[PDB]
Amino acid sequence: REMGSVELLSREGEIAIAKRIEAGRDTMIRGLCESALTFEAIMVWREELGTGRILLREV
């Protein structure tokens, strides 16, 4: 009863939902790429590159 009294169906609504999810992921990625918090934090792992353990195929 609860699922039927509040839910519906949408053919093209799934496309809009996917576009909204993609926009949210894009905005989150744009907001997470900052300076002195994420660049220097992840750079300590990028400096470990050259051994092929987690620098390539992992990060």
Place this chain on the structure above:
DNA sequence: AAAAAAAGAGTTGACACCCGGGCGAATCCCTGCTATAATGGGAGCTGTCACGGATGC
């Protein structure tokens, strides 16, 4: 009238062996990934009363 040894103890090397702990190897359990379109559910009484109590205007 005397006087020493098969047992009885006591060990000393000499195997026979019997589960324990590793070294392997062979093999179980988990977990996730599959891209045409899938869009609200199946029994069950209903052939006992009667009492004793719990809601309602």
